[PDB]
Ligand binder design. Structure first.
Ligand SMILES: Cc1cccc(C)c1OCC(=O)N[C@@H](Cc1ccccc1)[C@@H](O)C[C@H](CC(C)C)NC(=O)c1cccc(N)c1
Length: 331
């Protein structure tokens, strides 16, 4: 296929978060979403949502769409970040220049997601993980488009925006060379759930062999197991503000190590310039480390936004793998 591909522009927010737009209904009602490789359902607040978080948002009115098909099955959507609840509905979903009938969650109660939702500019969340990661056993949007021949390949890629520099693009259907430099290395999904792969993690002299690494566009920090983080902070001139998950350091702290994740195919690193937020802050150069300690049953690193900002990433449902390449600095 001489190119093709459905490109959706990603809108940056202070190098912290980014968003993308999609539409629901044959009348293509507009909504801003967190495009999330770490969940597998699409949800939008309904016209029937009276909570406070819903007051500033674009709302879905299924009565204005001929393609709406009632479902009604009640759903409670529990993220680590909070809870939204509502019911299943079916209607047309438009992503970029493609449309398909689709089952999403019409949310009527966001109390379990406030004050977060109230202080959010996104309307909803659009999951991009595997079918089994979803509530309802909903086949991924991209898998669908492929089934219906609307796209070349059942894969999507993320070219994240870089603040002040350039825009991003979630590209569905194929891989565009305009976004990366050097080689594109594939790492096999270890499971068809999250986009999780096995990499040895190394920082300084601490090494965690065969760490489970979740590639999540929906996580704004790099997460690290706590015992690993504990060993690496020893003597680093990095201060933890107690109670709150924040780690601060002088932006010029020479001791700051580079994260190194490796497979027999490639070696991915994240230098201090990539995980340090602030830069020229409160006082001299106090910088915040965009890293937080988080423990899962098996040692896991969530390779969130800070990793994806440096690395162009490819998500291939056909080959059950994640491809990784150095993102091009500018378009
Ligand atoms: C924003 C942020 C900062 C730092 C660390 C994290 C983890 C983070 O992100 C917080 C967060 O909630 N992110 C999620 C998406 C999200 C982002 C913003 C607001 C709400 C949800 C997903 O990216 C990841 C999340 C956790 C996994 C990786 C353990 N998945 C589920 O909870 C989930 C998955 C499948 C099914 C269901 N029902 C739920």
């Amino acid at each position: 296929l001489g190119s093709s591909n459905d490109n959706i522009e990603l809108v940056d927010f202070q190098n912290i978060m980014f968003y993308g737009d999609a539409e629901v209904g044959d009348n293509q009602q507009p909504f801003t979403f967190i495009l999330d490789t770490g969940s597998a359902n699409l949800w939008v607040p309904s016209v029937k949502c009276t909570t406070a978080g819903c007051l500033t948002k674009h709302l879905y009115d299924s009565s204005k769409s001929r393609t709406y098909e009632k479902d009604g099955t009640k759903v409670e959507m529990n993220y680590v970040s909070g809870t939204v609840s509502g019911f299943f509905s079916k209607d047309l979903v438009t992503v970029g220049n493609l449309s398909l009938p689709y089952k999403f969650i019409e949310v009527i109660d966001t109390n379990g997601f406030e004050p977060t939702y109230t202080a959010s500019t996104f309307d909803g969340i659009l999951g991009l993980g595997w079918k089994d990661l979803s509530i309802g056993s909903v086949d991924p949007i991209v898998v669908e488009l492929k089934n219906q021949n609307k796209i070349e390949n059942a894969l999507f890629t993320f070219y994240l925006p870089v603040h002040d520099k350039h825009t991003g693009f979630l590209t569905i259907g194929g891989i565009e060379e305009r976004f990366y430099e050097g080689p594109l290395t594939y790492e096999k999904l270890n499971h068809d759930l999250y986009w999780q792969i096995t990499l040895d993690a190394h920082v300084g002299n601490i090494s965690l062999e065969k760490a489970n690494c979740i590639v999540d566009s929906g996580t704004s920090a790099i997460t690290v197991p706590t015992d690993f983080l504990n060993k690496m902070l020893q003597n680093l001139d990095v201060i933890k503000v107690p109670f709150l998950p924040f780690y601060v350091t002088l932006c010029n702290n020479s001791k700051l190590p580079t994260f190194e994740f490796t497979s027999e195919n490639g070696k991915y690193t994240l230098e201090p310039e990539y995980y340090l937020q602030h830069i020229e802050d409160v006082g001299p150069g106090l910088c915040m480390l965009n890293i937080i300690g988080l423990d899962f049953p098996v040692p896991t690193f969530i390779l969130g936004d800070p990793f994806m900002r440096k690395y162009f990433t490819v998500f291939d449902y056909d080959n059950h793998s994640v491809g990784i390449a150095l993102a091009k600095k500018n378009l």
